[PDB]
From Swiss-Prot:
One of its GO terms (biological process) is maintenance of CRISPR repeat elements. Changing residue 717 to A: Only cleaves 1 DNA strand, probably the noncomplementary strand. Processes guide RNAs correctly. In vivo, loss of Cas9-mediated CRISPR interference in plasmid transformation. Residues 756-1025 are annotated as: PAM-interacting domain (PI). Residues 56-73 are annotated as: ARM. Residues 1-62 are annotated as: RuvC-I. Disruption phenotype: Loss of correct processing of pre-crRNA and tracrRNA. Loss of immunity against a plasmid with homology to CRISPR spacer sequences. This is CRISPR-associated endonuclease Cas9/Csn1. Residues 605-652 are annotated as: RuvC-II. It comes from Streptococcus pyogenes serotype M1. CRISPR (clustered regularly interspaced short palindromic repeat) is an adaptive immune system that provides protection against mobile genetic elements (viruses, transposable elements and conjugative plasmids). CRISPR clusters contain spacers, sequences complementary to antecedent mobile elements, and target invading nucleic acids. CRISPR clusters are transcribed and processed into CRISPR RNA (crRNA). In type II CRISPR systems correct processing of pre-crRNA requires a trans-encoded small RNA (tracrRNA), endogenous ribonuclease 3 (rnc) and this protein. The gene is cas9. Its EC number is 3.1.-.-.
Length: 1025
DNA sequence: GCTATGAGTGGCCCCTGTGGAGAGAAGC
DNA sequence: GGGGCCACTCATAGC
RNA sequence: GCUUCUCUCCACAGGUUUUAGAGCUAGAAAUAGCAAGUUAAAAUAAGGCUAGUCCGUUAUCAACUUGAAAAAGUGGCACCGAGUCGGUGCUU
């Protein structure tokens, strides 16, 4: 006998609950075989559980990092281009100049040339630094001086401008000498070009030098005043780099705001600080040069400075004059945002179409890359696809053919009643054409009264006509056709079907592009038929929006019997007069066959396809995929007999179409059999419910839940969802409530942490200073971390068990050892390629290959007394046990917590308050149970004693505060990484388990996605010492 | 009797701000 | 939020 | 007309690290005084081959067997009880 049953589901941003129930709402118990080398061969479990897993993340951070990588690469490319331009002349002056520029980051031992980068000698370096304290002094010197400058200095200035080429927020050429646009220039320039009264073509350098000199004078004044009045604080302000003073502001990491905050009280205590205080009010005291406000500098300023320098120095260097346009273009060139990455097809991101196979350079971007086709593809990819034709593309909403289709479809169902007619009749094809020509091409809006007084009365001589199916005006109209009559002014050109392709392409061009240059370039192909004035009028017209049907669907496919398209049928269909719906649903035509051929039944959907295509955050996508896998595994468990009903709830991410999509996916996977009439047999009913009903069900029958106790709440909520759904669809309070009460107190609830392989960054991005520790990771292959600092805190992807011998001590004695070795994400490919060699590099000897077992994150180990640990990393564990608090205590805690916030009748509230008053002794029992659980599985003796002392010291607190603090106390016992928490006025530190040696002799457990199947491996038996 | 270790406790640490442009879906 | 690192400090195994 | 899922591209400013910008005086040193302090180069996830002015942090992943992978297969029931689950009867 196939035992009928039902399955309930709960979907969350972090957890999914699974539960199997029968008509009796009981949870059946079955016994499962255990695989491995343990004596425990079979375990009985309850068919209930919930999966916990990390929140899914979006690609937004990945997208940002990819953009940054490309930007860095292109900046390097621009530097390389400038280097190639200057290389031939540089070889004539200094061969190793670029070599020094490259390896300057290495120590003096690792340099292959002289240590001074710019000149290769100390005297000239001192001269350079003295004559030009900052780069802006050099820039101003090059802008103004007419003397033949040193080539290397010119290269340095050009590189500095290129690598900091500014922003492109304003198009066109800007006037640095600067109604509203001029006002915008004046406002923006003065914010950067502050009071630049000297007549110069490079005001930015003058402003920066003024700021530097003001900084110098202000610092001198502050030093003098402090040394005269407050000698004791001189060392603290000007030598203590750990504070927020000047030493911290320059040598340390202190920023501008912190420095001002620290210095403001000091200025208040001295005399003569009014000017300094005023400058503090304007954020002008001791300001740096390389500051964040520079982000508003337009690129045009740097372009002007570059142009001036090139003009000044070109007379001494002929090669500059020939390449002046090239140098200017390098700065001005940016890849247009609609082109995309310049890839050779080997990337899933790019969409460029290439004309010639030459290497793309900034000087030949125009000649090699089709900007028009590039923009077409850019708009075209990931644009909405036709539903009827998945491969094709929908036409623009303002397409002429779309307007014709809408007009003919609207007129398709129009009936007219005249004198002598007993029944209304459809309009014939000739009638449709005449009506369209007379009104739809002559009136921007066509109404019922207009038709009556213009076609029936005038043309067909019908005095009285009744029109049905149209509400006082026709929704479809030839507005685009009227615009084309306005601009082109050639009726026959528009009415010729030979021009349909050109007109449709023109409409598409006007719909796609907003840059009028692109429109002009693409319509330049059609300028041979239209004069310049008509071309000018069209270029001003713009359209937006997309339709719901494609060209190939309407006027592309033909009936194999008649050869007519859908447009052809709508123009004239005789007595049938089928509309679009009838044409696509008529069996006598091949259009339905064409549509069915268009539908693609590929691999199992909602495995990857819908998971990556449904609308929502990736987290809910992950949750739905896990739910589907859980349902499949449950079906596998139940003997592959599909459940009668499925109840699902989607928790709000702290009428939704995503719920309907999940329902459809579940129906598709479960109901797969068609009947004799090609109709799917729904042996599985899919149920959607509201959380409000289940919440009220909980509130009505004292079946409260607390999210802070343990994770059984998801499973219980799913169980209640299923029970309520089944009860409502089928529609014994004596038996069902008792069954629910028994189920809710069940301790054996399979909770499994989803084992995962950690991915992401290799390590923390904060580069730490050098220090004598081998745990420091280099930024490059050949850069010793002790000598150059680098990355720290790598993230381990997983650890692999090692059974081998290690040389220990100075004697290098081989000692047989057993230990856990973690593998970092940066090392994953190297290890998985050949574990033996990688382990040999680590120093392990006599590797036992067959014993290597993959142990990902959250791998579960079993210890004595039922104590469990989850492998958080190669050197840290997490708690693996849940507090099974009896239901009556949970209800008491809920009532005490909401004691002053009860939402119910006064009598019910009074009864609950009296019940709370009666059972105040529950506090001691809860505390004792917490203590026993902690002693048995937590091992937090010091923190446990502190907690016990705290509870005794405040046994007399009000019940509500007692309950609130006791609820917070569960943080020590919750599953996962231990977390600190406050209990009344005392802070409790987090007990962290930094010892992983004990799990070597433990019981390793592998659990399925639901954990019903268990595979237990005893690591102690392997490689006994 | 000496040293490596390793086991435990407590506390600090983690890259940030902005701009431009381009289809839908779900809801106000 | 949670894991990696450092700095003391003492217990204990190995020489 | 406004919010979000986008999710992709083009962009800027920073920030971090090492090196360079000769510290001086008295003192053997510890140290004491003095002076200066604003900038520059390179990298900005190890690197990989398809060698691109491309790609590298989204998504996917219990164990055993077959498969490059995808993919597929691999695990009795019933009853009675319930502190992380136990006992009883048939069968292979």
């Amino acid at each position: 006998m196939d035992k009928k049953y039902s399955i309930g589901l709960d979907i969350g941003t972090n957890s999914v609950g699974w539960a199997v129930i029968t008509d009796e709402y009981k949870v059946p118990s079955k016994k499962f075989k255990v695989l491995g080398n343990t004596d425990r061969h079979s375990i009985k479990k309850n068919l209930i559980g919930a999966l916990l897993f990390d929140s899914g993340e979006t690609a937004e951070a990945t997208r940002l990092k990819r953009t940054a990588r490309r930007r860095y690469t292109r900046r390097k490319n621009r530097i390389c281009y400038l280097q190639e331009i200057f290389s031939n002349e540089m070889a004539k002056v200094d061969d190793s100049f670029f070599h020094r520029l490259e390896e300057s980051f290495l120590v003096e031992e690792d340099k292959k040339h002289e240590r001074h980068p710019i000149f290769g000698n100390i005297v000239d370096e001192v001269a350079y630094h003295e004559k030009y304290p900052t780069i802006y002094h050099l820039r101003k010197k090059l802008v103004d001086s007419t003397d033949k400058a040193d080539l290397r200095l010119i290269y340095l200035a050009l590189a500095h401008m290129i690598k900091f080429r500014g922003h492109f927020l304003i198009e066109g050429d800007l006037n640095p000498d600067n109604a509203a646009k001029n006002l915008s220039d004046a406002i923006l320039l003065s914010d950067i070009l502050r009071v630049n009264t000297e007549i110069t073509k490079a005001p930015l350098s003058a402003s920066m030098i003024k700021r530097y000199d003001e900084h110098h004078q202000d610092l001198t004044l502050l030093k003098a005043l402090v040394r005269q009045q407050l000698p004791e604080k001189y060392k603290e302000i000007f030598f203590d780099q750990s504070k927020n003073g000047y030493a911290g502001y320059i040598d340390g990491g202190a920023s501008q705001e912190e420095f001002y905050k620290f210095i403001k009280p000091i200025l208040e205590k001295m005399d003569g600080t009014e000017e300094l205080l005023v400058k503090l009010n304007r954020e002008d005291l001791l300001r740096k040069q390389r500051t964040f406000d520079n982000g508003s500098i337009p690129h045009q300023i740097h372009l002007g400075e570059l142009h001036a320098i090139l003009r000044r120095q070109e007379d001494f260097y002929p090669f500059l004059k020939d390449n002046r346009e090239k140098i200017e273009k390098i700065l001005t060139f940016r890849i247009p945002y609609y082109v995309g990455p310049l890839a050779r097809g080997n990337s899933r991101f790019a969409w460029m179409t290439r004309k010639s196979e030459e290497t793309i350079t900034p000087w030949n971007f125009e000649e090699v890359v089709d900007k028009g086709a590039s923009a077409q593809s850019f708009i075209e990819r990931m644009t909405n696809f036709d539903k009827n034709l998945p491969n094709e593309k929908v036409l623009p909403k303002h397409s002429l053919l779309y307007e014709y289709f809408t007009v003919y479809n609207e007129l398709t169902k129009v009936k007219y009643v005249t004198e002598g007619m007993r029944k209304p009749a459809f309009l014939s094809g000739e009638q449709k054409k005449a009506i369209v020509d007379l009104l739809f091409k002559t009136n921007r809006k066509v109404t019922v009264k207009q038709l009556k007084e213009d076609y029936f009365k005038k043309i067909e001589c019908f005095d009285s006509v009744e029109i049905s199916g149209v509400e006082d005006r026709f929704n479809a109209s030839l507005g685009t056709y009227h615009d084309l009559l306005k601009i082109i002014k050639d009726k026959d050109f528009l009415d010729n079907e030979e021009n349909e392709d050109i007109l449709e392409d023109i409409v598409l061009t006007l719909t796609l592009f907003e840059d009028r240059e692109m429109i002009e370039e693409r319509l330049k192909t059609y300028a041979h038929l239209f004069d310049d004035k008509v071309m000018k009028q069209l270029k001003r017209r713009r359209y937006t929006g997309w339709g719901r049907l494609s060209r190939k669907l309407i006027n592309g496919i033909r009936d194999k019997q008649s050869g007519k398209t859908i447009l052809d049928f709508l123009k004239s269909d005789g007595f049938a007069n089928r509309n679009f719906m009838q044409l696509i649903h008529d069996d006598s035509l091949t259009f339905k066959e064409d549509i069915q051929k268009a539908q693609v039944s590929g691999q199992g959907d909602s495995l990857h396809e819908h998971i990556a295509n449904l609308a929502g955050s990736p987290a809910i996508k992950k949750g739905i995929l896990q739910t589907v896998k859980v349902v499949d595994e449950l079906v596998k468990v139940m003997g592959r007999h599909k459940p009668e009903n499925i109840v699902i709830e989607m928790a709000r991410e702290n009428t939704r179409q995503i719920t309907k999509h999940v329902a459809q996916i579940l129906d598709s996977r479960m109901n797969t059999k068609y009947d004799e009439n090609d109709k799917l047999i729904r042996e599985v009913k899919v149920i959607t419910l509201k959380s409000k009903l289940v919440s009220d069900f909980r509130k009505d029958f004292q079946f409260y839940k607390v999210r802070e106790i343990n994770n059984y709440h998801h499973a219980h909520d799913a169980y209640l969802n299923a029970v309520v759904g089944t009860a409502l669809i089928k529609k014994d309070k004596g038996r069902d409530f008792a069954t629910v009460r028994k189920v809710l107190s069940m301790p054996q609830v399979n909770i499994v942490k989803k084992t995962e392989v950690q991915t992401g960054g290799f390590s923390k991005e904060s580069i730490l200073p050098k220090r004598n520790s081998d745990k420091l990771i280099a930024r490059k292959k050949d850069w010793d971390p002790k000598k150059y600092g680098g990355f720290d805190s790598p993230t381990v992807a997983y650890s692999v068990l090692v059974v081998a011998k290690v040389e220990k001590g100075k004697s290098k004695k081989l000692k047989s050892v057993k230990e856990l070795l973690g593998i970092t994400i940066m090392e994953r490919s190297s290890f998985e390629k050949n574990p033996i060699d990688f382990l040999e590099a680590k120093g392990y000897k006599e590797v036992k290959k067959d014993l290597i077992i993959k142990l990902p994150k959250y791998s579960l180990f079993e210890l004595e007394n039922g104590r469990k640990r989850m492998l958080a990393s190669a050197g840290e564990l997490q708690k693996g046990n849940e507090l099974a608090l009896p239901s009556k205590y949970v209800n008491f805690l809920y009532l005490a917590s909401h004691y002053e916030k009860l939402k119910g009748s006064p009598e019910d509230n009074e009864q609950k308050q009296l019940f709370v008053e009666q059972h105040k002794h529950y506090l001691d029992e809860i505390i004792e149970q917490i203590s026993e659980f902690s002693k048995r599985v937590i091992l937090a003796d010091a923190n446990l004693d502190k907690v016990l002392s705290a509870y005794n010291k405040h046994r007399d607190k009000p019940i509500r505060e007692q309950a609130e603090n006791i609820i917070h106390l569960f943080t020590l016992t919750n599953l996962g990484a231990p977390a600190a928490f406050k209990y009344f006025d005392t802070t409790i530190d987090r007990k962290r388990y930094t010892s992983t040696k004990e799990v070597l002799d433990a019981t390793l457990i592998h659990q399925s996605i639901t954990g019903l199947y268990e595979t237990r491996i005893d690591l102690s038996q392997l490689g006994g010492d």
